[PDB]
Amino acid sequence: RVVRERMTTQDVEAITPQTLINIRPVVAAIKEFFGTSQLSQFMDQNNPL
Amino acid sequence: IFKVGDTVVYPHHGAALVEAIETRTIKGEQKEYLVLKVAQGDLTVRVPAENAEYVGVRDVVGQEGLDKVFQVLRAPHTEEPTNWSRRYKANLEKLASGDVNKVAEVVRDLWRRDQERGLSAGEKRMLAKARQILVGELALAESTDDAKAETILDEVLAA
Amino acid sequence: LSFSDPRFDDVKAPVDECKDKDMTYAAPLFVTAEFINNNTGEIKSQTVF
């Protein structure tokens, strides 16, 4: 969505993939899955079983 | 025109070494492509040989070009519009043209105005971009020791 | 704009060091992005973290 959104503004033949790509939502999606989700749980360490 | 090993200048990205010439097929015809290895962000640019002049790829300039850009870089009476947006669009469309004279004009205007006051985030970013592609094109034009070419540009700017 | 070929580097620090120093055991991911300008014909290919 941000790729299209800042693809329309910027001048063509002056743009490049590292000017189109914003990786912050991908980073935040993986981070908020691994912390604060129901299926990413604290490991049960009482014994090996 | 172009040969493998030539150092051509791409418009918005500065220097570019022509490292190979591909022969890709689009719509059943072998429009040959040439691959360029620029080093600003480490991107490989591929263009047809037909639309090289259409996109405005350009060889490096000679010593008449060097004295011409120094002559325009040491020139007064460079009155600018006082509006910040007008000025920004003006030297941005000067920077996007790909001419060494226009890039030297942008770096001298922003260098004198930064020596005056120190402008802004956007204008310091633009001055960094313009001065780095001017330094790269000068070092391509004389094979003259990167960052010592930066000292050369600083010396001829300060005068 | 299209993406291709994911790659991983080596992990930044091993598991015991990650547990001791309060870090995350992770590896950097690199993909190959590619930009096409149809009216002229231009392929601007990078390698995006």
Q: At what angle do helices B63-73 and B100-116 cross, to 10 degrees?
A: 30
Q: At what angle do helices B100-116 and B148-158 cross, to 10 degrees?
A: 70
List, as one string, the DSSP characters of chain B.
Answer: ---TT-EEEETTTEEEEEEEEE---BTTB---EEEEE--SS--EEEEESTTHHHHT-BPPP-HHHHHHHHHHHT-------S-HHHHHHHHHHHHTT--HHHHHHHHHHHHHHHHHT---HHHHHHHHHHHHHHHHHHHHHH---TTHHHHHHHHHHH-
Q: Tell me how far apart the 2 most distant CA atoms of chain B are, in Å.
A: 58
Which two structure tokens, joined as six digits, stand for C31?
């993909």
Which single residue is written with the structure tokens 């022969």?
B23
Specified resolution (Å): 2.7
Question: Is there a contact between B45 and C43 if contact means CB atoms under 8 Å apart?
Answer: yes
Q: What is the three-class DSSP state of A12?
A: coil
Select the residue of B12, B41, B43 nearest A14 (Cβ to Cβ): B12
Among residues B17, B39, B59, the one where a domain terminates is B59
- Measure the CA–CA gap between A19 and A28, rounded to whole angstroms: 19
B39 CB near a chain A CB, below 8 Å? Answer: no
CB count, 10 Å around CB of C13?
14
Residues B34, B80: one domain?
no
Experimental technique, in short, is cryo-EM
What is the tally of structural domains in chain B? 2
Which single residue is written with the structure tokens 């480490």?
B42
Residues B71, B134: one domain?
yes
Chain B residues within an 8 Å CB radius of C41: 26, 31, 47-48, 51
Question: Is there a contact between C41 and B31 if contact means CB atoms under 8 Å apart?
Answer: yes
Which two structure tokens, joined as six digits, stand for B66?
């060097």
Residues B48, B84: one domain?
no
Question: Is there a contact between C35 and A13 if contact means CB atoms under 8 Å apart?
Answer: no
Range of the domain at B32: 1-59
The runs of H, that is alpha helices, within C1-49 are 15-20
Main-chain dihedrals φ then ψ at residue B155, nearest 5 degrees = -65, -45
Residues B68, B122: one domain?
yes
Contact by Cβ (8 Å): B48, B31: yes
Which single residue is written with the structure tokens 């993909």?
C31
Q: B37: Cβ–Cβ under 8 A, 6 or more apart, which residues?
A: B16, B17, B19, B44
Residues B35, B73: one domain?
no
Main-chain dihedrals φ then ψ at residue C37, nearest 5 degrees = -110, 110
Chain B residues within an 8 Å CB radius of C47: 42
Chain B residues within an 8 Å CB radius of A18: 41
Among B130, B140, B136, smallest CA distance to B109 is for B130
Question: Is there a contact between C45 and B46 if contact means CB atoms under 8 Å apart?
Answer: yes
Indicate left, alpha or beta for A33 from its phi (over 0: left) and psi (-120 to 50: alpha): alpha
- Measure the CA–CA gap between C15 and C25, rounded to whole angstroms: 6
Contact by Cβ (8 Å): B12, A13: yes
The long-range contacts involving B111-114, CB below 8 angstroms and separated by at least 24 positions, are B111/B157, B112/B78
* A28 Cα to chain C: minimum distance (Å): 14
Residues B113, B42: one domain?
no
Select the residue of C40, C45, C47 nearest B51 (Cβ to Cβ): C40
Among residues B59, B80, B99, the one where a domain terminates is B59
Q: Tell me how far apart the 2 most distant CA atoms of chain A are, in Å.
A: 61
Residues B16, B94: one domain?
no
Question: Is there a contact between C42 and B42 if contact means CB atoms under 8 Å apart?
Answer: no
Beta bridge partners of B9: B15, B58
Chain A residues within an 8 Å CB radius of C1: 3, 7, 17, 20
Amino acid (1-letter code) at residue B23: T
Contact by Cβ (8 Å): B108, B100: no
Interface test with B, best of A9, A11, A16 (most B CBs within 10 A): A16
Residues B91, B153: one domain?
yes
